[PDB]
């Protein structure tokens, strides 16, 4: 019944969409499910995305840790 919640921010939309795609792929190859991702309105020239991972497994968490996210994208992540 826990969820991984992720918020992405970037000044470069190309980087944010690539990071979002990478997170989605990592989750799905992991046996987990994705909710979203969704874009939020851009604020102060900052692009914003939200994505959640439901039914995460240990393999999901490990795959997310291994994933190298590009310079220039901020990722806030929680599990609960």
């Amino acid at each position: 019944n826990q969820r991984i919640r992720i918020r992405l921010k970037a000044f470069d939309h190309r980087l944010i969409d690539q990071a979002t795609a990478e997170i989605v792929e990592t989750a799905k190859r992991t046996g987990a499910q994705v909710r979203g991702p969704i874009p939020l309105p851009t604020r102060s020239r900052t692009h914003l995305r939200l994505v959640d991972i439901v039914e995460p497994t240990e393999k999901t968490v490990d795959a997310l840790m291994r994933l190298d996210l590009a310079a220039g994208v901020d990722v806030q992540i929680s599990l609960g």
Partner: protein
Amino acid sequence: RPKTLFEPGEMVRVNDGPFADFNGVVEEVDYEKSRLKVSVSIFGRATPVELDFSQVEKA
């Protein structure tokens, strides 16, 4: 015998979930919700995540 006394700016230790084996500081604390707001320096960037007192150890 981990201590449950945590305060803003205090460093903590994570030993559960993918954030296990990582340290960070608790910028915000929530005794009512029993959750600590600590971020982990991952990829060279802080990753503010909520961890339980037992999920992390006092540093």
